[PDB]
Every structure is written in structure tokens, then in C-alpha cells.
């Protein structure tokens, strides 16, 4: 019989983990820019949720390349497909807004 006594302990663990990741990845926002996706099954199709990664198509239409996308902190998925038109539009707008916000520091 397991008991989760460490609910308070592991929240403090997880928070300090994020604090270290903040200290090491200083200007960057801890997590990658994830897409916006329509959920499967009749029950949940009304819900629109955070997907895994974009696509080569959504990345190419935004105005950047796949390998470069990952270095600027955009999660890229390759097995996901662009069947829906409205989702495609929403993600492209999401990337273009993100590209206006980003400030990529020089390597010198």
C-alpha cells in the first residue's frame, strides 16, 4: 500500500527543477513553442489543444527551415499531417507572431 506523503515535497522538487532550468537556460522560456491542434474522437473534437510539434509544411509556410526551427526553440513533428485548413492557418499565424517576438542573439 503506497501513500503519497511527498505531494508537498515533490512540488518543491519540481519547482526547484524549473528554477535550475531557468538558471541554466537564462533568457529562454523553459519550454518549446508548441502548436495548436484539434483533438480526436467525436466527444472531444470541439476542444482545441496544444499539439506536439508543427510540421515541415507549417514551418516552411511560416518562413523558416526545419533544422533552424529547432534551434530557435520550435518543437517540430514529422509524422503529424496537415489535413485541416483552419488548424494550418492558426499555427502559421502562431509562428509568425512568435518570430516577431523572438530576439536571437549573435554568436560573436
Amino acid at each position: 500500500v503506497k501513500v503519497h506523503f511527498d505531494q508537498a515535497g515533490k512540488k518543491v522538487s519540481r519547482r526547484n527543477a524549473r528554477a535550475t532550468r531557468a538558471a541554466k537556460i537564462a533568457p529562454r522560456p523553459l519550454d518549446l513553442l508548441r502548436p495548436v491542434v484539434r483533438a480526436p474522437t467525436v466527444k472531444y473534437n470541439r476542444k482545441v489543444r496544444a499539439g506536439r510539434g508543427f510540421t515541415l509544411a507549417e514551418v516552411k509556410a511560416a518562413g523558416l527551415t526545419a533544422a533552424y526551427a529547432r534551434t530557435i526553440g520550435i518543437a517540430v513533428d514529422h509524422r503529424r499531417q496537415n489535413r485541416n485548413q483552419e488548424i494550418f492557418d492558426a499555427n502559421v499565424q502562431r509562428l509568425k507572431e512568435y518570430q516577431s517576438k523572438i530576439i536571437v542573439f549573435p554568436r560573436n
Binding site: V1, K2, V3, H4, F5, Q7
Partner: protein, 177 residues
């Protein structure tokens, strides 16, 4: 190059050419020991597509096993005990008899400096890969553990003891559900 021709030649196993090679080699391998070292892999196309480079540090042990637990894993386990410094990478079928089966298990020396260098194979040097065959982490071991993806492998995907312990032990929170 030739590996396409060999790949297709190894398909027709009971055909006249390969049938004759079997009956000669089956006699020859019985003359030698139970567990012994072959200098070169007899089916080199298969050796390659299971991760063998013909450089210093790679060893091809030939192993004999009885007929009628799995025989491929027993073959790997036998060479593991004899050649303890080596690490089992993969094994493959070469020849069989009515009484015995033969496998040409391929090994890597983690201690040899030609493997400690190059990054394509230096992963095997990591102590997490000591006796891969004794834990079923080889190709045939992972096969017998029923570890794939699908509806078929639901009760035995991420450890059959792990999913049992998860399902048959009570879980309670601080503020009870």
C-alpha cells in the same frame, strides 16, 4: 554492391547451391568445439545488417545448441559466460541439423581502444550494457519478452512485473479520493 546478390541468395535456402554448403559446414562445425571463434562471418551481409564492422574489436563466435526456453538466447548466454570481457551485440542463424542448431553470435570488446574512440559504437562501453543477453536486451530477448507496439502487447509492454505491481497494490493520497 554484392550485398544485394547475397541478400537474395540467402533467401533460397533449400536451393541446390546453399543446400550443398549446409551439408559440408554442418559436418565441419561438428568437428570443432561447442563454442569456438570463427575468423570471419559466413553470412557477412547478415553480420553487417546486425551491426558488424570488419575492424579490430569485433569477434564472431560460432555456437552449437540442442533442439527441443528459446535457443537463440541460450546461444548468446553460453558465449556470454565463456567470453565475459566481450559484450553480446546480436546473433543470427547460419546452419542447422536434426539434433543441433548453429548460430554466429557477434561480439564487441569494450576494452579495446578502437571501440572506446568512435561514437557509433562507444555506447556499448557504458556499464549499463554488461550482459545484454542475461537480461533479454538483445534482438531475440526483446522478441521473447513480447516488447513491441500494438493492441497485441498491452499486458506486456513496459515490464510485465511492473504492470502487475502497478495494478495489484493500493494507492492512497494525502487528501483521499
Amino acid at each position: 554492391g554484392a550485398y544485394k546478390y547475397l541478400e537474395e541468395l540467402q533467401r533460397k535456402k533449400q536451393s541446390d547451391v546453399l543446400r550443398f554448403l549446409q551439408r559440408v559446414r554442418v559436418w565441419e562445425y561438428r568437428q570443432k568445439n561447442v563454442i569456438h571463434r570463427a575468423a570471419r562471418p559466413t553470412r557477412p551481409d547478415k553480420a553487417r545488417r546486425l551491426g558488424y564492422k570488419a575492424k579490430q574489436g569485433f569477434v564472431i563466435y560460432r555456437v552449437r545448441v540442442r533442439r527441443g526456453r528459446s535457443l537463440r538466447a541460450t546461444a548468446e548466454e553460453r558465449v556470454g559466460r565463456r567470453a565475459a570481457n566481450l559484450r553480446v551485440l546480436n546473433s543470427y542463424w547460419v546452419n542447422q541439423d536434426s539434433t543441433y542448431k548453429y548460430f554466429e553470435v557477434i561480439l564487441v570488446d569494450p576494452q579495446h581502444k578502437a571501440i572506446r574512440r568512435d561514437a557509433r559504437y562507444n555506447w556499448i562501453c557504458d556499464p549499463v550494457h554488461k550482459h545484454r543477453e542475461a537480461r533479454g536486451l538483445t534482438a531475440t530477448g526483446k522478441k521473447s519478452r513480447g516488447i513491441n507496439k500494438g493492441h497485441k502487447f498491452n499486458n506486456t509492454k513496459a515490464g510485465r512485473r511492473k504492470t502487475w505491481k502497478r495494478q495489484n497494490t493500493l494507492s492512497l493520497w494525502r487528501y483521499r479520493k
